[PDB]
């Protein structure tokens, strides 16, 4: 829900119900090896080395 390109724009979480709008955020993620990450998450993002 964070990483969905469209659904990040209306993210909401149980604590504070109100939707947030993350669309402008430039997320970054760091993983030591690309193979262990589950396929649905791994398939979106580019894997620079």
């Amino acid at each position: 829900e964070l990483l969905d390109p469209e659904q990040n724009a209306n993210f909401l979480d149980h604590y504070l119900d109100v939707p947030v709008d993350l669309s402008k955020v430039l997320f970054i993620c760091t993983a030591n090896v690309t193979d262990t990450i589950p396929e649905p998450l791994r398939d979106r993002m580019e894997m620079i080395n």
Partner: protein, 48 residues
């Protein structure tokens, strides 16, 4: 079997085109297969 994976690829190509427009050189990117390897890199699978 799903179409999700192709959906990631075409996303990537488009967003690189967006970078080529707003700041890059071309005002109209024109992907061609010879061009393609730039955008989406070199082929991974072939020898099914």
């Amino acid at each position: 079997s799903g179409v999700r994976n192709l959906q990631k690829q075409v996303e990537k190509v488009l967003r690189k085109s967006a970078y080529k427009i707003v700041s890059g050189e071309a005002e109209s990117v024109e992907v061609t297969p010879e061009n393609l390897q730039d955008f989406v890199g070199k082929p991974v699978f072939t020898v099914e």
